[PDB]
Design a protein around this ligand. Structure first.
Ligand SMILES: *[C@@H]1O[C@H](CO[C@@H]2O[C@@H](C)[C@@H](O)[C@@H](O)[C@@H]2O)[C@@H](O[C@@H]2O[C@H](CO)[C@@H](O[C@@H]3O[C@H](CO[C@H]4O[C@H](CO[C@H]5O[C@H](CO)[C@@H](O)[C@H](O)[C@@H]5O)[C@@H](O)[C@H](O)[C@@H]4O)[C@@H](O)[C@H](O[C@H]4O[C@H](CO)[C@@H](O)[C@H](O)[C@@H]4O)[C@@H]3O)[C@H](O)[C@H]2NC(C)=O)[C@H](O)[C@H]1NC(C)=O
Ligand SMILES: *[C@@H]1O[C@H](CO)[C@@H](O[C@@H]2O[C@H](CO)[C@@H](O)[C@H](O)[C@H]2NC(C)=O)[C@H](O)[C@H]1NC(C)=O
Ligand SMILES: *[C@@H]1O[C@H](CO)[C@@H](O)[C@H](O)[C@H]1NC(C)=O
Ligand SMILES: *[C@@H]1O[C@H](CO)[C@@H](O)[C@H](O)[C@H]1NC(C)=O
Lengths: 193, 206, 93
């Protein structure tokens, strides 16, 4: 029984595939090979940059040069000593993308009544991402959350001048460019009041 | 606005309803023929007078209200025919791209969930919104004082899909009226939906 | 053009996602609409000298027809994911 590899594409900049080396009684130092489901260009390639846990391979890192989101990614873990001891996995990369937290949040006074929130994305296109805005007032009440789709702008039609508002957003690679379900880390909060 | 003919304007509710209005010797009966290029059917309706120089028609393209009768690549030829002495005479003929002429159904089910002396949360439901455009929903509401004008009112924008607004800075024991409307800004070629049935509410006294 | 196929691919994806939901739980209406969009996507690719992409669009149109009669649950998910993956590639790039 070999540990299952878990891959995550981070902001479509680099891919970190890792396996749990503690499952085996003796660290056998496994090897990872990958290829893509594309015809006439199909053959495996050994991991160029291995990750390490106690001088034993903990995982593998794949750079953007070797990342094709919309071609089925076939990863294969194997024991170098015993070749018959191998595990293969079929991964859709566009459903495993975790974005980097949105940055450059800006609040603007659209009117004396309403204010607008705008943010940006580092690497991924704004068309692809799906955002989740959270805002709460000076009362420190529970966050009021709602999802904005594919446009990095959020509207607050009515505001209380006495109350102090806070804002934070996080993105997701879903649903038109990928089907990823993991939300990104929260942005740095932006306050008004 | 329709591309091929000048004076005819038609609107698609993004589900199964296309409504055309004609802006105008004058004969008794006139009809509107619509035939899609991808679909084999041919729908017809009779124009009826609504106001001065305005005649309306309703092409019901489906059996369900939420049925997706047209797509983004559809193109139906809208023809206006009027019965004369010798019979049907083709008055107008034009092309019509449905998802470039979108006018959704007005928001409904407006109600107040919470109301304070200065705070108020108002909800509203939507109907006949296609899955094609549902993620791109946008809302605009206007709040007016009772007795004042709707053009005097303050129009608030919800550039996301919220379907509620929490109002602040409201005067105690004061009556307001609110209307909401909806749009999908994919390519911004469509127009705003009509204003919802106004909701009249009064804040708690001080 | 690329802007036209991007817009059509997003609407085709909404049909494909709705059908996948129906499969795992009006399917003829969404499938017929899906076929019309993929027909137009193929023609747009044919006009732009991208024969391989047009061949993919014609393939996905046939896969959708097979999905309503494919017995293998594992193959149904593969064909659904394959359609969705390609549409997302057209939307992204
Ligand atoms: C298929 O679609 C058609 C039309 O397409 C739709 O058009 C607009 C209205 C949007 O909903 C689009 O999303 C969509 O494409 C549907 O017919 C329309 O239905 C609406 C709602 O029922 C209706 O609007 C209401 O009309 C009420 C009065 O109706 C009677 O009179 C009119 C003639 O009106 C004339 O007189 C009035 C003064 O009395 C003038 O103000 C006006 O300018 C005209 O000169 C007549 O045509 C009708 O048949 C009736 O006999 C009116 O009271 C309502 O106002 C209230 O509600 C609105 C919100 O809807 C608020 O904003 C207001 O403040 C009020 O509170 C509405 O104005 C349209 O007139 C209908 N249009 C047509 C062409 O029939 C149809 O139902 C759909 N069918 C299906 C099966 O889905
Ligand atoms: C105004 O009312 C709406 C509707 O009840 C509230 O929307 C809820 O928001 C929370 C998170 O903020 C969600 O978990 C609920 O599912 C939402 N309900 C609905 C029906 O969408 C909204 O929070 C209220 N406004 C404020 C400021 O609290
Ligand atoms: C990269 O790999 C490391 C090592 O396993 C892991 O801790 C990390 O979560 C991976 N992803 C990122 C974005 O660092
Ligand atoms: C495990 O394999 C890696 C392969 O890069 C190697 O660098 C490392 O030295 C090996 N560890 C041991 C203990 O042999």
């Amino acid at each position: 029984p070999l540990p299952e590899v878990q891959c995550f594409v981070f902001n479509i900049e680099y891919m970190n595939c890792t396996w749990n080396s503690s499952s085996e009684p003796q660290a056998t130092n496994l090897t990872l090979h990958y290829r893509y489901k594309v015809s006439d260009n199909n053959t495996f390639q050994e991991c160029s940059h291995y990750l390490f846990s106690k001088e034993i391979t903990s995982g593998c890192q794949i750079q953007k040069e070797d990342i094709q989101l919309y071609q089925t990614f076939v990863v294969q873990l194997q024991d170098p000593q015993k070749p018959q001891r191998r595990a293969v996995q079929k991964l859709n990369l566009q459903n495993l993308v975790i974005p980097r937290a949105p940055e450059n949040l800006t609040l603007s006074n659209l009117s004396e009544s309403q204010l607008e929130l705008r943010w940006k994305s580092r690497h991924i296109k704004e068309r692809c991402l799906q955002y989740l805005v959270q805002y709460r007032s000076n009362r420190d009440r529970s966050w009021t959350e709602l999802i904005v789709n594919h446009e990095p702008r959020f509207s607050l039609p009515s505001v209380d001048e006495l109350k102090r508002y806070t804002f934070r957003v996080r993105s997701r690679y879903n649903p038109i460019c990928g089907s990823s379900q993991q939300w990104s880390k929260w942005s740095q909060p932006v306050h008004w009041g | 606005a329709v591309k091929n003919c000048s004076h005819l304007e038609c609107f698609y509710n993004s589900r199964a309803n296309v409504s055309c209005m004609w802006s105008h010797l004058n004969v008794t009966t006139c009809h509107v023929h619509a035939k899609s290029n991808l679909r084999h059917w041919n729908k017809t309706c009779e124009l009826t007078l609504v106001r001065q120089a305005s005649w309306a028609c309703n092409l019901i393209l489906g059996s369900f209200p939420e049925s997706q009768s047209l797509t983004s690549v559809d193109l139906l030829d809208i023809n206006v025919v009027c019965w004369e002495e010798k019979g049907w005479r083709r008055v107008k003929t034009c092309d019509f791209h449905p998802f470039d002429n979108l006018r959704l159904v007005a928001p409904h089910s407006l109600q107040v969930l919470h109301i304070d002396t200065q705070r108020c949360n108002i909800s509203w439901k939507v109907s006949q919104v296609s899955h094609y455009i549902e993620p791109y929903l946008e809302f605009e509401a206007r709040r007016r004082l009772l007795g004042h004008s709707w053009e005097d009112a303050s129009v608030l924008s919800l550039k996301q899909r919220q379907q509620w607004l929490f109002l602040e800075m409201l005067i105690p024991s004061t009556s307001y009226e609110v209307q909401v409307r909806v749009k999908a800004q994919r390519n911004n070629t469509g127009t705003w939906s009509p204003w919802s049935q106004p909701l009249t509410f009064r804040t708690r006294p001080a | 053009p690329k802007k036209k196929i991007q817009l059509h691919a997003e609407h085709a994806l909404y049909d494909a996602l709705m059908i996948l939901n129906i499969v795992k739980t009006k399917l003829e209406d969404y499938a017929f609409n899906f076929e019309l969009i993929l027909e137009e996507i193929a023609r747009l690719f044919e006009s732009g000298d991208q024969k391989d992409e047009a061949e993919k669009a014609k393939r996905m149109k046939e896969w959708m027809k097979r999905i309503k009669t494919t017995a293998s649950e594992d193959e149904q998910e593969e064909m659904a994911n394959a359609i969705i993956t390609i549409l997302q590639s057209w939307i992204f790039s």
